[PDB]
Design a protein around this motif. Structure first.
Motif, PDB file in Angstrom:
ATOM      1  N   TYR A 249       0.855  -1.189   0.000  1.00  0.00           N
ATOM      2  CA  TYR A 249       0.000   0.000   0.000  1.00  0.00           C
ATOM      3  C   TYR A 249       0.892   1.241   0.000  1.00  0.00           C
ATOM      4  CZ  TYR A 249      -3.884   3.124   1.262  1.00  0.00           C
ATOM      5  OH  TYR A 249      -4.833   4.131   1.284  1.00  0.00           O
ATOM      6  N   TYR A 250       1.916   1.200   0.844  1.00  0.00           N
ATOM      7  CA  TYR A 250       2.879   2.283   0.964  1.00  0.00           C
ATOM      8  C   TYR A 250       3.554   2.520  -0.388  1.00  0.00           C
ATOM      9  CZ  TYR A 250       6.962   4.729   3.055  1.00  0.00           C
ATOM     10  OH  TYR A 250       7.943   5.605   3.449  1.00  0.00           O
TER      11      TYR A 250
ATOM     12  N   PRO B 253      -8.833   3.054   4.238  1.00  0.00           N
ATOM     13  CA  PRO B 253     -10.176   3.502   3.833  1.00  0.00           C
ATOM     14  C   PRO B 253     -10.550   3.443   2.348  1.00  0.00           C
ATOM     15  CG  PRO B 253      -9.340   4.861   5.596  1.00  0.00           C
ATOM     16  CD  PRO B 253      -8.159   4.102   5.026  1.00  0.00           C
TER      17      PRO B 253
ATOM     18  N   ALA C  15       6.174   3.661  11.743  1.00  0.00           N
ATOM     19  CA  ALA C  15       4.986   3.148  11.071  1.00  0.00           C
ATOM     20  C   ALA C  15       4.711   1.714  11.507  1.00  0.00           C
ATOM     21  CB  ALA C  15       5.168   3.214   9.561  1.00  0.00           C
TER      22      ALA C  15
ATOM     23  N   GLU D   9      -0.842   9.891   8.688  1.00  0.00           N
ATOM     24  CA  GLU D   9      -0.651   9.640  10.108  1.00  0.00           C
ATOM     25  C   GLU D   9       0.181   8.382  10.330  1.00  0.00           C
ATOM     26  OE1 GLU D   9      -0.666   8.712  14.144  1.00  0.00           O
ATOM     27  OE2 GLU D   9      -1.102   7.407  12.425  1.00  0.00           O
ATOM     28  N   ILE D  10      -0.281   7.276   9.761  1.00  0.00           N
ATOM     29  CA  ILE D  10       0.383   5.990   9.900  1.00  0.00           C
ATOM     30  C   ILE D  10       1.823   5.939   9.391  1.00  0.00           C
ATOM     31  CG2 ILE D  10       0.324   3.554   9.254  1.00  0.00           C
ATOM     32  CD1 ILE D  10      -2.713   3.732   9.190  1.00  0.00           C
ATOM     33  N   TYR D  11       2.027   6.295   8.127  1.00  0.00           N
ATOM     34  CA  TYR D  11       3.354   6.208   7.546  1.00  0.00           C
ATOM     35  C   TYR D  11       4.315   7.374   7.718  1.00  0.00           C
ATOM     36  CZ  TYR D  11       1.198   2.218   5.020  1.00  0.00           C
ATOM     37  OH  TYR D  11       0.571   1.061   4.596  1.00  0.00           O
TER      38      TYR D  11
ATOM     39  N   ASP E 154     -10.374   0.706   8.407  1.00  0.00           N
ATOM     40  CA  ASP E 154      -9.990   1.852   9.223  1.00  0.00           C
ATOM     41  C   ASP E 154      -8.530   2.234   8.993  1.00  0.00           C
ATOM     42  OD1 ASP E 154     -12.035   0.551  11.841  1.00  0.00           O
ATOM     43  OD2 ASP E 154     -12.502   2.216  10.469  1.00  0.00           O
ATOM     44  N   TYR E 155      -7.727   1.283   8.526  1.00  0.00           N
ATOM     45  CA  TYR E 155      -6.328   1.583   8.241  1.00  0.00           C
ATOM     46  C   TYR E 155      -6.133   1.919   6.764  1.00  0.00           C
ATOM     47  CZ  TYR E 155      -4.874   0.372  12.919  1.00  0.00           C
ATOM     48  OH  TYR E 155      -4.748   0.425  14.282  1.00  0.00           O
TER      49      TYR E 155
ATOM     50  N   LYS F 215       3.090   1.353  14.800  1.00  0.00           N
ATOM     51  CA  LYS F 215       1.664   1.666  14.819  1.00  0.00           C
ATOM     52  C   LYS F 215       0.816   0.536  14.234  1.00  0.00           C
ATOM     53  CE  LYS F 215       2.367   6.672  14.633  1.00  0.00           C
ATOM     54  NZ  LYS F 215       2.179   7.946  13.884  1.00  0.00           N
TER      55      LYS F 215
ATOM     56  N   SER G  46       8.778   3.270   7.781  1.00  0.00           N
ATOM     57  CA  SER G  46       9.589   3.575   8.962  1.00  0.00           C
ATOM     58  C   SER G  46       9.297   2.660  10.148  1.00  0.00           C
ATOM     59  CB  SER G  46       9.350   5.021   9.399  1.00  0.00           C
ATOM     60  OG  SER G  46       8.099   5.135  10.058  1.00  0.00           O
TER      61      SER G  46
ATOM     62  N   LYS H  78      -5.251   8.790   7.175  1.00  0.00           N
ATOM     63  CA  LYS H  78      -4.639   7.544   7.624  1.00  0.00           C
ATOM     64  C   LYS H  78      -3.258   7.310   7.037  1.00  0.00           C
ATOM     65  CE  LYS H  78      -7.839   6.506  10.412  1.00  0.00           C
ATOM     66  NZ  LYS H  78      -9.065   5.734  10.017  1.00  0.00           N
ATOM     67  N   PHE H  79      -3.107   7.562   5.746  1.00  0.00           N
ATOM     68  CA  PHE H  79      -1.815   7.355   5.121  1.00  0.00           C
ATOM     69  C   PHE H  79      -0.740   8.274   5.707  1.00  0.00           C
ATOM     70  CE2 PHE H  79       1.087   5.868   2.024  1.00  0.00           C
ATOM     71  CZ  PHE H  79       1.833   6.957   1.605  1.00  0.00           C
TER      72      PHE H  79
END
Ligand SMILES: Nc1ccn([C@@H]2O[C@H](COP(=O)(O)O)[C@@H](O)[C@H]2O)c(=O)n1
Ligand SMILES: Nc1ccn([C@@H]2O[C@H](COP(=O)(O)O)[C@@H](O)[C@H]2O)c(=O)n1
Ligand SMILES: Nc1ccn([C@@H]2O[C@H](COP(=O)(O)O)[C@@H](O)[C@H]2O)c(=O)n1
Ligand SMILES: Nc1ccn([C@@H]2O[C@H](COP(=O)(O)O)[C@@H](O)[C@H]2O)c(=O)n1
Lengths: 248, 248, 248, 248
Positions: free
Chosen positions: A62-63, A103, A240, D126-128, A100-101, A243, A237, D123-124
């Motif tokens: 996804y990243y 969307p 990341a 915040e998370i990454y 939620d992670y 989390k 990271s 989300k993207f």
């Protein structure tokens, strides 16, 4: 989705580079999966209708996709996680909090489960015989659940050893983190059960020995070369990972 | 389902072999349960509308049914797990992920619970008095929830000891892994509460002392003998068990 | 439910025995709670529209109600558990599996929660000030959520000490296992917020100092005496408790 | 909600005190957050359409808001918890039982999640990248999800250090218990993605360097001074905390 429309399902087998472009439909949506961006040329174009990623590497994929999109290397409408809702195959927390992670993405199973009989077919073979369909077939099931009736297959070679993929997968970051009959019988079941049509775009592939080749509609498709493209998966990271730890 | 249609509910008691075939309706659906395939003859035919299995043996029964179907010994439209959503009776994880492990099957309780009053009747007797209805009655409740109004009973003998089943159950694999009044009062409650009609197809059974015999419509049904048939439950691989372990 | 109809909410205070029967409406539904069956006379008749029980004693109360019904001492259409979905007040497993253990009953909260503002009113006072409404008020909230617009109150005395209940509660089995202002302000909030009307049927009660007495429609109601009636709660078997243990 | 209507989103930055009141729309709803009541004057009036509070202080903020309302210092229609359904940001039990502890309030995420693309955007980042939008932006996302198309911003200064808030936050009880670019890019994404219009009400703020100032419709708004007002958050009893402990 795109009911009535035509879709090209691309596996990443060596036949992805042996597409008979004269059999390519004049218009189509494209489904790609896993390390598709590793390709050295845009064998099916920059625009994808959907990209699929296994749950085990979804966090990193996804990243990476976001980087691919930001850098204008590819575009996609849908992002799918190819899950099955099976304890031994996916982290349970990952699936429960998925929306939620991520969307703008979908749990592939939400579409896969609409085909009750194929879900049963897959589950019975996986659970009791350790026979699992590959991503190429999973995508066909999702394509059908989405309304597609004409599916063109490419890059599905059933791991012939001679060549593992259509590109070099010996990538630093990727390294750091099934059978012919199982897939063929599954595709047969899919075709005969939901009355859709499967076509093969690669005449030199083993798939061509089982499913008919797509007609020679002949299109004027252009294959663009890639330069300084992303050819390895990106690693998020440590922050990341911290989390997303609960979802392993 | 099949509202308006007629259904034959078959227990596996010795009366299954004493069906008065002249009282068999001209057309009907058939509900079978547990070790029905152990029968030495097709007392009710090869086609079942539904087959029921207790949660404790569902994993193995489902596996066996697929073999029965593949070998063309039986056919069924529905596959039901006779559960009650009770902690002391079923593995909780089994029930929660049921549709993901057996997509083409149903949790019997999803239909059983539609009969709120009978569910209450069953729960009150089971919980407070340790009085539990048998599979034969469970199937009657599901049949009613599905729209059936005429139910023909067979193979329900209330365990008379004289003969435990209509076949030899002394099978290797099976071995390795209630009362008259409780069932009768439950059937009475079912008949009087949901206004359906119960008929008995076996005049020599104890059930015939409580519910009226089906009329003599007289049909030309043919009872086929079985040969080299499956007469023991099949045991899945250790690998399979390892994958289904969480559901005990 | 019964929107438009009139309902009599009966607490079990000593005023239950001081109903001014000339103020009793000509037609009505009756809501009873907890140890109502301990009454020595049918102060409000044998037919109840609903009976309420706290979660702490629901297991035993449900068991007892079935005995009351079987023995023809009382009849009821609805069975309600007066819960609030609060960890410190009810066993969480009890609430989550409630409908599977008591299919013909309801979680009172499913109706109570429809009154969002009163639920907030109750929660705020309970949580932050340790001020909790009694069962009498809880029933009024459920009555309103069910469509009732005219509510007649009786047996609500706010524990005046002089007399704790309208009957002797010194019962063997029962023994083995709030304020005026809190209830009054809650009833006021209910009346003014949902525009319903509250009437008092007991002129000698403290409730009569706050809410108006019901008109003198004058009815010809007959109060029947009870004989050899059930006057203690029943205790289920150790086996039963073992099955319901998880729900404490 | 209030689709079509205009809304003023107020952060608590020092620019809250530098509103150009001649640019204030003639009619509007007001969204406030966190320590808004600390203001020394009613910069935007006593009536709020909604107030937002972070999950970490919701228990105490809700308690305080009820006091503010009871004392007639402020009024609000909606009470929102600004959550994201993220394990590392909120107590999971808090979110799951939210509506049972605060019935008249809402989980902000229930509206925030309707904007799938912005939820993904948030989300993207915040998370990454550990890049989180502030409450001011969160409210804009909720306003849009609720149907607002014209949003006027105030009190959003991106923590300029020169002055942290529009009031003194050195309060006893409060003490006891992001970037410019992140917020600006988020607001841009919001404006361009959902086709809404953002206006700035404070010409001296940094926000004024990025988004256009609201037109000079010129209104006759009156700013009322506050006296003996609540200027510190209230702390609930140890008993209350004991009941809410599970939700940390
Ligand atoms: N040699 C190969 C390699 C890939 N493939 C297919 O392409 C997909 C490739 O991605 P993976 O090998 O990462 O799963 C497989 O899921 C399968 O459908 C193939 O059929 N033959
Ligand atoms: N002797 C017997 C044996 C079976 N039966 C019934 O047939 C069903 C048989 O399967 P089981 O004994 O495996 O449960 C029972 O659930 C019950 O309805 C009966 O009524 N009398
Ligand atoms: N003295 C009394 C006793 C009972 N009551 C009320 O009657 C109900 C009685 O049942 P409990 O005391 O078991 O809760 C209370 O919930 C309350 O509404 C009362 O108001 N005054
Ligand atoms: N100096 C400041 C202080 C507050 N703010 C904003 O106001 C809100 C204030 O409440 P908090 O500082 O409590 O979050 C922030 O969420 C943000 O939108 C700002 O933009 N500049």
């Amino acid at each position: 989705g795109s009911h009535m429309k035509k879709v090209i399902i691309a596996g990443n087998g060596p036949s992805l580079k042996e597409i008979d472009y004269s059999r390519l439909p004049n218009d189509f949506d494209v489904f790609r999966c896993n390390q598709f961006y590793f390709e050295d040329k845009y064998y099916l174009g920059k625009k994808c209708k959907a990209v699929f990623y296994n749950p085990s590497l979804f966090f990193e994929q996804y990243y990476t996709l976001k980087h691919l999109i930001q850098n204008q290397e590819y575009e996609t409408e849908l992002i799918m996680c190819s899950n099955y809702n099976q304890a031994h195959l996916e982290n349970e927390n990952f699936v429960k909090t998925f929306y939620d992670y991520f969307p703008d993405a979908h749990l592939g199973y939400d579409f896969f489960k609409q085909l009750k009989d194929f879900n049963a077919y897959f589950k019975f073979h996986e659970i009791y015989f350790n026979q699992r369909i590959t991503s190429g077939v999973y995508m066909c099931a999702v394509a059908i659940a989405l309304g597609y009736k004409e599916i063109y297959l490419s890059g599905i070679d059933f791991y012939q050893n001679g060549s593992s993929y259509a590109f070099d997968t010996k990538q630093k970051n990727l390294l750091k983190l099934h059978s012919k009959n199982t897939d063929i019988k599954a595709l047969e079941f899919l075709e005969k059960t939901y009355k859709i049509k499967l076509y093969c775009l690669c005449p030199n592939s083993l798939l061509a020995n089982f499913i008919g080749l797509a007609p020679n509609l002949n299109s004027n498709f252009i294959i663009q070369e890639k330069n300084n493209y992303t050819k390895d998966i990106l690693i998020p990271s440590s922050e990341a990972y911290g989390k997303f730890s609960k979802n392993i």
